[PDB]
Write a protein that binds this ligand. Structure first.
Ligand SMILES: CCCCCCCCCCCCCCCCCC(=O)OC[C@H](COP(=O)([O-])OCC(O)COP(=O)([O-])OC[C@@H](COC(=O)CCCCCCCCCCCCCCCCC)OC(=O)CCCCCCCCCCCCCCCCC)OC(=O)CCCCCCCCCCCCCCCCC
Ligand SMILES: CCCCCCCCCCCCCCCCCC(=O)OC[C@H](COP(=O)([O-])OCC[N+](C)(C)C)OC(=O)CCCCCCCCCCCCCCCCC
Ligand SMILES: CCCCCCCCCCCCCCCCCC(=O)OC[C@H](COP(=O)([O-])OCC[N+](C)(C)C)OC(=O)CCCCCCCCCCCCCCCCC
Ligand SMILES: CCCCCCCCCCCCCCCCCC(=O)OC[C@H](COP(=O)(O)OCCN)OC(=O)CCCCCCCCCCCCCCCCC
Ligand SMILES: CCCCCCCCCCCCCCCCCC(=O)OC[C@H](COP(=O)(O)OCCN)OC(=O)CCCCCCCCCCCCCCCCC
Ligand SMILES: CCCCCCCCCCCCCCCCCC(=O)OC[C@H](COP(=O)(O)OCCN)OC(=O)CCCCCCCCCCCCCCCCC
Ligand SMILES: CCCCCCCCCCCCCCCCCC(=O)OC[C@H](COP(=O)(O)OCCN)OC(=O)CCCCCCCCCCCCCCCCC
Lengths: 173, 605, 99, 172, 458, 64, 57
């Protein structure tokens, strides 16, 4: 369809066959058929009129690709020139990572309702994906404050590396 | 597929009368009838989602329009189609449509009848997006729109200052409740990192101490439980249809509706349930206790509403969410009748609303007589009626469970009192002798009343079955129990009928009545409104002037920094300018300046 | 006399000259024009056309840009099995580890 | 100005049996204890001694405060009733009428024409009634809030406009 | 840059125009300049909109300028109640001060230099005391000017010494340069006073509990035009400053914030409680402004992403409503010629539409959802709760009082029974009703898509 | 008018810095401010103490 | 209607609209002085098309 069913995956849907054992007429069958043959058709004709009109002329848009630039790490100290570009990429990555956790949340949002009463089991993998996404996001941009920056994120990144390397060194012995 | 479109229309088609009202095209007269048809057509539209539900059971989420892409947070307009939502809608539309019929009967001389009907619809929208709200922000949208409209609605006649006093009191108690609501939002956004209800359930907060008590406090606000109870009985000050619709069947139960909507998360914490049993218990005892000896025709039934609310949230207390929702539909059915019936006899009895001057209306107004008796019998739990299928099933459930010790005895004792004031209201208002003023203007032959009462009347008689059987089994059925407490749901109401009847008959026995101390306790609403509305309000607001305004801002804060420095320059600027003008004193000073410069401090050295 | 002073003039309510006054000035025709001009140059353009000016604003902080080049980035990772977002934003091999 | 010994018992009786009605509820019960209230009231009619009479006031009121209904009964139209100042939402003062637009007063021409005549009566009788007032005020203003009546013919009773043009109790 | 020249260009506009066209000509061009200003929320992503060497804009400034450029028409028709009897030259000079005021606020928000910001920041004072003292109504308006200006300079002047000190140390104070060339603030005792000097200047133009005596002493006695502009944008000048100056005051901010945010926290309950016991109607909005303004003091102090968004959202929303309640103050005050709350009562039975504006004003100030007041206040609560869990019991208890005094003014003035002896209130002109409409509609119809209002961190 | 002056402006002209006003001013002034200082600082250091070795759980606490 | 009068009355509203067009000119006049990195940013190094000559102005 319009989206992709791998980044917005949808589990296959199973719907049982209508098997009314009772003899009295099923009302719900009646409401859908009048609904379909009185409202669903006219809006479809309006839509198909729209689609053919939208197919009369075809203007397009495209994707804005940004090539990779050196980050604030290899950026020279006090060098404003490459600092601006380095900061620009860091914040653009922040927007990208912000959407990544949004995608997982939306995947997590759809999973729970779709699984309904059995939401504890067929969404455990979704919960695991959200857990590591959230955990790694806290290792990434988090707690820097209102005036977050690439340097501040690099500062936190260095802080983790010094702590984890020192802890691994003493624990290994 | 149809489910998404039909339920959404039930919300959209409910708002056109508001926009047409703003267009001013309505030439009065037709507008109240126009409003009724929209609500009635909204009800009929709201059926076909419900009949869909029992057929299969599909429940959807209709998040449609994105509002905030707030970093990881994804605020969007989200409505959750679920059993609580899609079933409460026709019940809510049924009661509000029938009373919309009733409003024209009562208020026919009101010059602002169009504004009244517009207010009724605007509340309906604010409640509609509350019951079907998937994200917590939409819940607050409903939570606050409903409270604001109460202030407008029961403060309809600005007029008497007591109406505004009830308006200020009602909003203030509601204001206390949502403090926990904001606390829950902060906890959920910080810890659970979401505001939509279903995500919070997914993330499985197995120890949600702070969010749950805040939610419990929020329910304590709108449901008028202890601490925040007296706003319900005082809310009768507005028009009876307001009191018959807002805080008898719809608004006050919305507070209970919060906890049930959070039930998948609530039951994880055992501790949070102990105050729910605690709160609901004492509320049932207290509210019923006041209703026993009250006199205002609406005070008795308004206390019965709060007593009912304490009863139903006790159920969700002991792991009975769906049974609480079962009570949400039955209670909205017959309690509206009891308030609407009282509103009918008020209008006929030259707007008199004290049972001491009712009586003898059993034969004068038979239609209202039949409605109240069977309405009260449902309220007392007449077996195989609307009330019994919920109330007595609840009593059969709560007494047989792991719960607090005495906490099962209010719902036992309060049920006895629940039947007790039902007999008193029947005995004083309808039975007995006609103590009303000599000039009789009573009349109930208007078809608008007869159809309005009759619409829920077959509901209050036949609904109980038509919700009990069709809904899927969602609670464990109580099958094996002792005989005594299985029948005690029916026995307890019997002495509630019996002892109250004898006590009511004591008024017939010709002998003076001594004012009992316990009777004095019940007449003043158990002393809570007298004290809590006098001492805490006076002390805090007296501090607002003696200590806050006068002492600090007007005196202390303005004398420490600004006026001190103003006086410091003022205190000795005098002789800075005040000089005698003698050349002797000026030049003698020049001497000292010379010596201090080169000898004493010695800038050279 | 204490002080020669004009008495405080009364509030000349704008309706008494012209009952169709607009509370904008004394002159009637300017009052009519004052209502027309502020209502038109206000409510009409800045309130309605101003609304769709910023309601239909192009992509604000490239929000659509961020969403649509997020599915491609996430799709790359789990296909090869490595996590859909690392725990280290800047690359860790080239960063100089002090001592 | 004065609640003398006469009215105090008269007011005391009024609040006494009204509370009793709030107590007995039933008419037959109320009537028995009402006549007892009446009979016990005048059993000591001949009490020339005022000190005992004032004493008899003391056992009238303190147990009335004990014996008053904790939920006292009040009719809707009287202080504390359910309908006190209920219709103030509709009572708009008469002076708002002249502000009506020419279209609004052409809406009801006869009333406005009669209203103008009513305004006339106030205008050329005000100076007469204030002058009538002044010549009949005691020195140092009035010693009682009661207003004097119309002394001679023609002139309206002094200070009459608002008490006459008061909005109706049931305006709508 | 395209906003400033037409804004200056209105200076010859009003000063030359015909005797009766000065207000018509000024009203339209103030309405037309909202066009070019409305193209300032038109914004790129995280990078700020820098269109000149000396002028720049971002998602924090963008809501501010469109507020001020929109605001001036509001004070224009607001002043058309009591300036009619004045002479032409005085009438023309009133527009001169308002237009001169626009030229300043429109330029402080665009300033890309700390000193240039500060020069124009305190430059806005000179147009003000002309408004408050020359065109004021009561007697103590003279004391109003001294209280307002001396409070401002006593904090602003040490900031000037601080700014030049930063100029000498790091080299420049361009808002971008300090951001990119950031340096952590050491815990040295000298840095404490430099931090205090940098913040105190914006605190005084941010009514803090104790540094707020000029709030009731300026707004109440100021003219109607000066009242809203001083309460809607002028209080926000510090708000823009603190959001910018905090970029160079870390990590000293977190440890030093306790004396300040807490004083705002406790006073914001106190100041709201002041409104519960008041006798002057205009004092309600002044004190209510203090409590609402002090709310964002906490938000900026936490320096939390959510707090900054909530601060900006409440900043504009409070300015719009606080101005509105000042218009409703004016209409009632003009009709009754008094500022006493309890004098004019039962006004709804006489002015039903004016009651609706009173209803919407007090209810928006009540900050219900989804109004911008609520979303700004809610974001502050969540940020404050993350900082500390006890914060809810305090700032929540403000919302307790916030609903009270908001309805208290509505009940005692509009609701109830009218006082009989007032025979002055006429039907409301189309001016004030349109003035109220031009205040209420932008707030409501901004609620559908408020992401222009959250700020740069959005 | 007399009531307005008495409750708005006259308080300082007839104010006297008697000892009682000082205790009332101090108790209702810096009193609660320092009381909340004890409460807020204690939690802040307690919370900071707990996180610095990781007892407090922030598995999903990202929206700070 | 006496064009000279109608201009003596309504010519006032000229120098605010031209003030707007005055501003955008010096807005545009300020840009070309500020340009010193036309197509020099590493993130946008689009090759200069033969037909065109300037990346942006
Ligand atoms: C909002 C309120 C809307 C209804 C309304 O107007 O009530 C008026 C009503 C007051 O009516 P009233 O007391 O009869 O007024 C009498 C006056 O004399 C004035 O009225 P009147 O006596 O002259 O005529 C009677 C009536 C008829 O209406 C009017 O006369 C006024 C008409 C107002 C609009 C004027 C412009 C119309 C043309 C332009 C727009 C066209 C449409 C296309 C764009 O008046 C009104 O209804 C008053 C309207 C005042 C303006 C309200 C705001 C308008 C939009 C801004 O306001 C309230 O009751 C306050 C309610 C506040 C909201 C509470 C709930 C909030 C819940 C959250 C918000 C919703 C969130 C989303 C939910 C759904 C999610 C999926
Ligand atoms: C949907 C919204 C429709 C709006 C229709 C017009 C009504 C509102 C107009 C307000 C004015 C907006 C002007 C603006 O943003 O730029 C004007 C612009 C700004 O000045 P400019 O034209 O010199 O801008 C330079 C940039 N280029 C070269 C790309 C145009 O001026 C004109 O359009 C003339
Ligand atoms: C469906 C539905 O409801 O759609 C509603 C619609 C859509 O809202 P939306 O938020 O869904 O936006 C959709 C945008 N598209 C279609 C491109 C995806 O509402 C609008 O279009 C308007 C929303 C409000 C936008 C902001 C307007 C601000 C105007 C300010 C004027 C005054 C300025 C000066 C004063 C104020 C200064 C701050
Ligand atoms: C299983 C059974 C459990 C126990 C049930 C006890 C209650 C039974 C029903 C009693 C009904 C009494 C009644 O209806 O009384 C009506 C009467 C109305 O007032 P009135 O007509 O004035 O008569 C009183 C004197 N004035 O008012 C009265 O007579 C007042 C009666 C007050 C009774 C209070 C009982 C409280 C019981 C719970 C206490 C919990 C304490 C903790
Ligand atoms: C931290 C940053 C914020 C600080 C805020 C607090 C300090 C603000 C500035 C000082 C206070 C100014 C208040 C306004 C002026 C005032 O109150 O004047 C009072 C009075 C007016 O004159 P009058 O009406 O005659 O009354 C005389 C009464 N004795 O006039 C007087 O009595 C004389 C006033 C002289 C002092 C005011 C002018 C100078 C202000 C700076 C003084 C300190 C300078 C550095 C040392
Ligand atoms: C682009 C150039 C703009 C400037 C030149 C063009 C101006 C006119 C623009 C079109 C106006 C259409 C409506 C015209 C109505 C004219 C009514 C009239 O003549 O009113 C005159 C009158 C003042 O008195 P007097 O002139 O003596 O006439 C009456 C004598 N008994 O009564 C009055 O009220 C005087 C008029 C009041 C003000 C009317 C509006 C003037 C401004 C209009 C343009 C505003 C926008 C400009 C920028 C547009 C592009 C962005
Ligand atoms: C009443 C008037 C003010 C009296 C108190 C003045 C305090 C001055 C504090 C000060 O100068 O601190 C030193 C600091 C940096 O000093 P530096 O230039 O580095 O010299 C070597 C030592 N650090 O200085 C600076 O960083 C300069 C920036 C601060 C200047 C104003 C002083 C602090 C705020 C005072 C007013 C508060 C209200």
């Amino acid at each position: 369809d319009s989206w992709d069913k791998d980044v917005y995956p949808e589990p296959p849907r199973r719907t049982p066959a209508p098997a009314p054992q009772t003899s009295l007429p099923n009302p719900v069958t009646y409401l859908t058929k009048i609904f379909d043959l009185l409202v669903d058709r006219p809006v479809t004709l309006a839509r198909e009129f729209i689609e053919q009109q939208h197919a009369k002329n075809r203007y397009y848009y495209y994707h804005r690709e940004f090539r990779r630039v050196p980050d604030i790490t290899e950026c020279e100290e006090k060098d404003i020139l490459c600092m601006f570009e380095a900061e620009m990429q860091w914040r653009r990555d922040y927007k990208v990572d912000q959407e990544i956790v949004n995608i997982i949340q939306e995947r997590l949002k759809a999973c729970q309702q779709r699984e309904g009463e059995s939401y504890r089991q067929n969404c455990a993998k979704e919960l695991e994906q959200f857990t590591q996404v959230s955990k790694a996001f806290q290792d990434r941009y988090s707690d820097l404050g209102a005036h977050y920056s690439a340097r501040k994120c690099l500062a936190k990144q260095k802080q983790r590396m010094l702590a984890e390397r020192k802890a691994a060194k003493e624990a290994a012995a | 597929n149809p489910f998404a479109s039909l339920t959404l229309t039930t919300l959209i088609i409910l708002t056109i009368p508001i926009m047409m009202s703003n267009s001013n095209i309505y030439k009065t007269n037709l507008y109240p009838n126009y409003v009724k048809t929209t609500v009635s057509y909204a009800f009929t539209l709201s059926l076909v989602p419900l009949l869909m539900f029992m057929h299969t059971g599909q429940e959807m989420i209709i998040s449609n329009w994105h509002w905030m892409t707030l970093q990881t947070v994804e605020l969007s307009l989200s409505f959750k189609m679920d059993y609580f939502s899609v079933m409460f809608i026709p019940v809510a539309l049924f009661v509000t449509w029938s009373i919309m019929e009733f409003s024209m009967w009562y208020m026919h001389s009101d010059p602002f009848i169009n504004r009244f009907f517009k207010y009724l619809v605007l509340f309906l929208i604010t409640m509609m997006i509350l019951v079907t709200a998937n994200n917590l922000f939409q819940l607050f949208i409903g939570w606050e729109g409903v409270g604001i409209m109460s202030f407008l609605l029961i403060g309809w006649w600005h007029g008497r200052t007591d109406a505004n006093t009830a308006a200020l009191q009602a909003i203030l108690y509601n204001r206390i409740g949502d403090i926990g609501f904001v606390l829950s939002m902060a906890w959920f956004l910080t810890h659970s990192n979401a505001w939509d209800l279903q995500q919070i359930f997914m993330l499985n907060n197995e120890c949600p101490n702070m969010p749950l008590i805040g939610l419990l406090l929020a329910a304590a606000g709108k449901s008028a439980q202890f601490g925040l109870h007296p706003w319900l009985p005082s809310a009768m000050e507005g028009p009876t249809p307001v009191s018959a619709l807002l805080h008898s069947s719809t608004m006050v139960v919305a507070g209970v509706f919060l906890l049930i909507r959070f039930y998948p998360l609530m039951e994880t914490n055992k501790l949070v349930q102990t105050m729910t049993l605690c709160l609901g218990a004492i509320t049932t005892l207290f509210t019923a206790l006041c209703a026993i000896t009250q006199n205002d025709i609406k005070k008795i039934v308004a206390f019965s509403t709060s007593s009912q609310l304490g009863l139903m949230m006790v159920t969700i207390g002991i792991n009975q969410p769906h049974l609480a929702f079962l009570h949400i539909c039955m209670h909205a059915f017959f309690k509206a009748m009891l308030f609407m019936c009282s509103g009918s006899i008020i209008h006929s009895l030259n707007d008199e609303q004290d049972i001491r001057k009712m009586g003898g209306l059993y034969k004068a107004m038979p239609f209202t007589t039949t409605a109240l008796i069977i309405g009260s019998l449902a309220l007392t739990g007449m077996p195989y009626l609307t009330g019994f299928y919920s109330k007595d099933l609840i009593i059969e459930a709560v007494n047989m469970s792991y719960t607090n010790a005495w906490a099962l005895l209010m719902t036992l004792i309060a049920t006895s009192l629940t039947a007790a004031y039902s007999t008193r209201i029947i005995f004083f208002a309808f039975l007995g002798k006609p103590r009303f003023p000599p000039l009789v203007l009573i009349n109930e032959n208007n078809p608008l009343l007869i159809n309005s009462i009759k619409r829920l009347l077959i509901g209050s008689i036949f609904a109980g079955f038509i919700i009990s059987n069709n809904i899927p089994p969602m609670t464990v059925p109580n099958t094996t129990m002792p005989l005594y407490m299985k029948m005690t749901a029916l026995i307890v109401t019997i002495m509630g009928f019996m002892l109250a009847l004898e006590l009511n008959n004591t008024t017939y026995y010709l002998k003076f009545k001594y004012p009992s101390q316990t009777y004095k306790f019940s007449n003043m609403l158990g002393y809570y409104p007298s004290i809590m509305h006098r001492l805490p309000t006076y002390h805090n607001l007296s501090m607002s002037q003696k200590s806050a305004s006068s002492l600090l801002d007007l005196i202390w804060l303005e004398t420490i920094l600004p006026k001190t420095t103003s006086f410091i320059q003022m205190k000795m600027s005098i002789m800075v300018s005040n000089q005698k003008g003698l050349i002797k004193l000026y030049f003698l000073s020049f001497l000292i300046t010379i010596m201090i410069s080169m000898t004493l401090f010695n800038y050279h050295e | 006399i204490r002080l020669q002073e004009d008495p405080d003039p009364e509030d000349e309510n704008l309706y008494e000259k012209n009952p169709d006054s607009h509370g904008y000035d004394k002159d009637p025709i300017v009052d009519l024009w004052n209502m027309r001009v502020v209502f038109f140059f206000g409510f009409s353009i800045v309130l309605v056309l101003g609304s769709t000016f910023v309601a239909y604003l192009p992509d604000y902080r490239m929000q659509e840009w961020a969403r649509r080049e997020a599915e491609r980035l996430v799709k790359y990772r789990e296909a090869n099995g490595l996590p859909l977002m690392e725990s280290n934003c800047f690359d860790p091999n080239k960063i100089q580890l002090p001592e | 100005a004065y609640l003398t010994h006469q009215q105090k018992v008269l007011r005391l009786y009024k609040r006494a049996l009204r509370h009793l009605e709030s107590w007995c509820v039933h008419r037959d019960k109320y009537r028995y204890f009402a006549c007892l209230m009446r009979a016990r009231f005048d059993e000591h009619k001949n009490e020339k001694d005022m000190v005992k009479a004032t004493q008899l006031l003391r056992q009238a009121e303190e147990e009335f405060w004990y014996g008053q209904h904790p939920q006292p009964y009040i009719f809707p139209e009287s202080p504390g009733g359910t309908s006190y100042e209920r219709y103030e939402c509709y009572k708009v003062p008469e002076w708002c009428l002249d502000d009506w637009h020419p279209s609004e007063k052409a809406m009801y021409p006869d009333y406005f024409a009669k209203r103008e005549q009513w305004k006339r009566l106030r205008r050329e009788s005000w100076e007469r009634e204030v002058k009538q007032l002044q010549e009949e005020t005691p020195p140092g203003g009035p010693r009682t809030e009661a207003l004097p009546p119309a002394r001679k013919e023609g002139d309206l009773p002094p200070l009459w406009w608002h008490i006459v043009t008061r909005p109706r109790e049931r305006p709508m | 840059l395209k906003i400033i020249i037409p804004t200056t260009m209105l200076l010859p506009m009003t000063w030359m125009s015909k005797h009766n066209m000065i207000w018509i000509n000024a009203t339209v061009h103030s309405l037309l300049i909202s066009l070019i200003s409305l193209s300032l929320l038109n914004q790129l992503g995280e990078n700020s909109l820098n269109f000149s060497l000396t002028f720049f804009s971002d998602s924090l400034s963008a809501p501010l300028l469109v507020l001020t450029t929109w605001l001036l028409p509001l004070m224009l028709m607001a002043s058309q109640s009591h300036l009619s009897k004045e002479t032409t030259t005085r009438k023309k000079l009133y527009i001169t001060m308002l237009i001169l005021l626009q030229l300043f606020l429109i330029m402080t928000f665009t300033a890309t230099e700390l000193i240039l910001f500060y020069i124009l920041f305190e430059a806005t004072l000179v147009p003000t005391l002309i408004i408050i003292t020359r065109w004021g109504n009561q007697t103590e308006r003279l004391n109003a000017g001294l209280y307002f200006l001396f409070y401002t300079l006593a904090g602003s002047l040490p900031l000037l010494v601080a700014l030049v000190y930063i100029q000498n140390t790091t080299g420049s104070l361009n808002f971008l340069i300090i951001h990119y060339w950031s340096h952590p603030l050491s815990n040295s005792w000298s840095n404490i006073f430099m931090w205090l000097a940098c913040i105190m200047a914006f605190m005084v133009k941010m009514p803090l509990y104790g540094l707020h005596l000029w709030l009731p002493k300026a707004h109440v006695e100021a003219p109607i035009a000066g009242s809203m502009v001083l309460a809607a944008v002028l209080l926000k000048l510090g708000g823009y400053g603190m959001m910018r100056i905090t970029t160079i005051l870390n990590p000293l901010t977190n440890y030093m914030a306790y004396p300040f945010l807490m004083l705002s926290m406790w006073g914001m309950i106190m100041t709201s409680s002041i409104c519960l016991r008041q006798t002057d109607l205009k004092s309600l909005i002044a004190y209510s402004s203090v409590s609402h303004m002090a709310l964002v003091i906490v938000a900026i102090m936490i320096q939390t992403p959510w707090s900054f968004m909530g601060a900006t959202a409440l900043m504009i929303a409070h300015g719009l409503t606080s101005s509105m309640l000042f218009c409703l103050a004016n209409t009632n005050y003009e009709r009754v010629h008094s500022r006493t709350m309890i004098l004019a009562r039962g006004l709804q039975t006489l002015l039903p539409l004016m009651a609706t504006w009173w209803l919407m004003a007090s209810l928006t100030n009540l900050a219900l959802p989804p109004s911008i007041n609520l979303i700004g206040e809610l974001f502050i609560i969540t940020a404050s709760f993350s900082w500390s869990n006890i914060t809810i019991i305090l700032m929540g208890m403000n919302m307790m009082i916030t609903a009270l005094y908001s309805l208290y003014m509505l009940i005692t003035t509009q609701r109830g029974k009218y006082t009989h002896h007032i025979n002055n209130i006429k039907a409301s002109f189309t001016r004030e009703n349109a003035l109220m409409a031009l205040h209420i509609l932008p707030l409501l119809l901004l609620t559908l898509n408020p992401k222009m209002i959250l700020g740069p961190l959005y | 008018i007399r009531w307005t002056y008495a409750r708005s402006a006259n308080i300082y002209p007839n104010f006297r810095p008697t000892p009682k006003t000082s205790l009332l001013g101090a108790l209702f002034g810096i009193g609660p401010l320092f009381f909340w200082y004890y409460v807020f600082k204690t939690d802040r250091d307690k919370k900071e103490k707990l996180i610095q070795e990781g007892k407090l759980d922030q598995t999903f606490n990202i929206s700070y | 209607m006496n064009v000279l009068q109608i201009v003596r009355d309504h010519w006032v509203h000229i120098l605010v609209p031209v003030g707007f067009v005055f501003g955008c000119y010096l807005d545009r006049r300020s840009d070309e002085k500020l340009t010193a990195f036309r197509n020099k940013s590493l993130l946008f190094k689009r090759e200069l098309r033969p037909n065109e000559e300037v990346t942006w102005k």
